[PDB]
Amino acid sequence: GIITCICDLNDDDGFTIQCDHCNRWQHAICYGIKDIGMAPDDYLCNSCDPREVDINLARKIQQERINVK
């Protein structure tokens, strides 16, 4: 149950997805996965498989969640 995500704000945001390889968890929204339906059969985090992904946007979304708690 470790969250390791591209936002570097690794607390539970309520919707996480588990990397198939390293078994660490990411925030689905940081990876553009808005709901369960957007999650593919196979899934690897950005550490296990570098991808094009908007890291600044991920940080912005998560930092905003934290800032308005």
Partner: peptide, 11 residues
């Protein structure tokens, strides 16, 4: 993939 999702509701 394997997912965890928490739903918060109020009735």
């Amino acid at each position: 993939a394997r997912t965890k999702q928490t739903a918060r509701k109020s009735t």
